[PDB]
Structure formats: structure tokens, C-alpha cells
DNA sequence: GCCATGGCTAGTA
DNA sequence: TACTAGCCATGGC
């Protein structure tokens, strides 16, 4: 049974949907998974220094159920890339499987139903360029700046 | 299944 | 820089 909850943040009211089974989707407005998520974020923003101490919630969304490239990607990304780090679309294609399929990672990230958590903002253009971003480019930038990046 | 698309890239003039 | 032509896993239809 899908449940939703809002929470203030530097990015604006973040609304987290999800049931007892796992986190469904982190959306930006401007049960056990929610209690962990609403703590992981509240941590990430206001106490990034220690984000490893917090539990990554169970992800329920229909994207994590059916096996695909997308799933491998989102996974192969959440695992590999951590706070302050960054990985190129191609560097992430190589990880999930097809090193040529960097482009399809775009929509993968576009489609990512759990931004921040699953760091989509850490995926940038190969040219070093920050790249575009689903919830509006300003965010991707504020986040990386947040994660100690120079701009 | 066929085809348009988009958050990619390396190359080229 | 500006622009182009492979490469690719999706989502409509």
C-alpha cells in the first residue's frame, strides 16, 4: 500500500512515496523504508560528513524488479559511486555492461525514480562537462558543489 | 516488433 | 567551437 510523505530540504519539499516493501520514488516538489530514507537524506544534506553510518533503504519501484540494463546501471552506480566522486556516462556504461551504451544511461538517469539516493547527479559528460539533469540542471550543480566540487 | 528519441561521444572542418 | 554521424536501451504505438 503506497504511502507518501514530504520533508523540507535545501532543494525544497522532497516527497518520498513508498510502502512497507521498499522506497517507491523520491520526487522534488519545491513504514521502515521511509524512516531510513527520511534519515539518509536528512543526513546527506545536514551531516554529509557521516553518510556511511546510515542504511540505504529497500527499493520497491517496478524498475528494480524486472532485470534490465537500467537496473544493472542504477545498481552498478549506487554501489560504485559515493559522495564527492563522479563517473562519466561511458564510464558507467562499461560498468553495467555495454561500454557503448553510454547514451541509454541518459534515459536511465532520466528515468531514475530515486535521485540523490541513487546519485544521478554524480554522472557527468565525458568531456568533464557537468551535463544536463532531469529535475532541472540547477540541482545537479548545487549537489556537486555541495559534495565539495569546484565550480 | 518498427521507429523516434535523448542526460553521449570521438571526430572533423 | 559547431556540427555530424555511430551506438543504444527504452517507450509509444
Swiss-Prot record:
Record-annotated active site: 120
GO cellular component, one term: membrane
Catalytic reactions of this protein: a 6-O-methyl-2'-deoxyguanosine in DNA + L-cysteinyl-[protein] = S-methyl-L-cysteinyl-[protein] + a 2'-deoxyguanosine in DNA; a 4-O-methyl-thymidine in DNA + L-cysteinyl-[protein] = a thymidine in DNA + S-methyl-L-cysteinyl-[protein]
Subcellular location: Nucleus
Organism superkingdom: Eukaryota
Residues that hold DNA according to the record: 70, 89-90, 98, 103, 126
Amino acids binding Zn(2+): 19, 24, 60
Species the sequence originates in: Homo sapiens (Human)
Task performed by this protein: Involved in the cellular defense against the biological effects of O6-methylguanine (O6-MeG) and O4-methylthymine (O4-MeT) in DNA. Repairs the methylated nucleobase in DNA by stoichiometrically transferring the methyl group to a cysteine residue in the enzyme. This is a suicide reaction: the enzyme is irreversibly inactivated.
The protein, known as: Methylated-DNA--protein-cysteine methyltransferase
Amino acid at each position: 500500500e503506497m504511502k507518501r510523505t514530504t520533508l523540507d530540504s535545501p532543494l525544497g519539499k522532497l516527497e518520498l512515496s513508498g510502502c512497507e516493501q521498499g522506497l517507491h520514488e523520491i520526487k522534488l516538489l519545491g513504514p521502515e523504508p521511509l524512516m531510513q530514507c527520511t534519515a539518509w537524506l536528512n543526513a546527506y544534506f545536514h551531516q554529509p560528513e557521516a553518510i556511511e553510518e546510515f542504511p540505504v533503504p529497500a527499493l520497491h519501484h517496478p524498475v528494480f524488479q524486472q532485470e534490465s540494463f537500467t537496473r544493472q546501471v542504477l545498481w552498478k552506480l549506487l554501489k560504485v559511486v559515493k559522495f564527492g566522486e563522479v563517473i562519466s556516462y561511458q564510464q558507467l556504461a562499461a560498468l553495467a555492461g555495454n561500454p557503448k551504451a553510454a547514451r541509454a544511461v541518459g534515459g536511465a538517469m532520466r528515468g531514475n525514480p530515486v535521485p540523490i539516493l541513487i546519485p544521478s547527479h554524480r554522472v557527468v559528460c565525458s568531456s568533464g562537462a557537468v551535463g544536463n539533469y532531469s529535475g532541472g540542471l540547477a540541482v545537479k550543480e548545487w549537489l556537486l558543489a555541495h559534495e565539495g566540487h569546484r565550480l
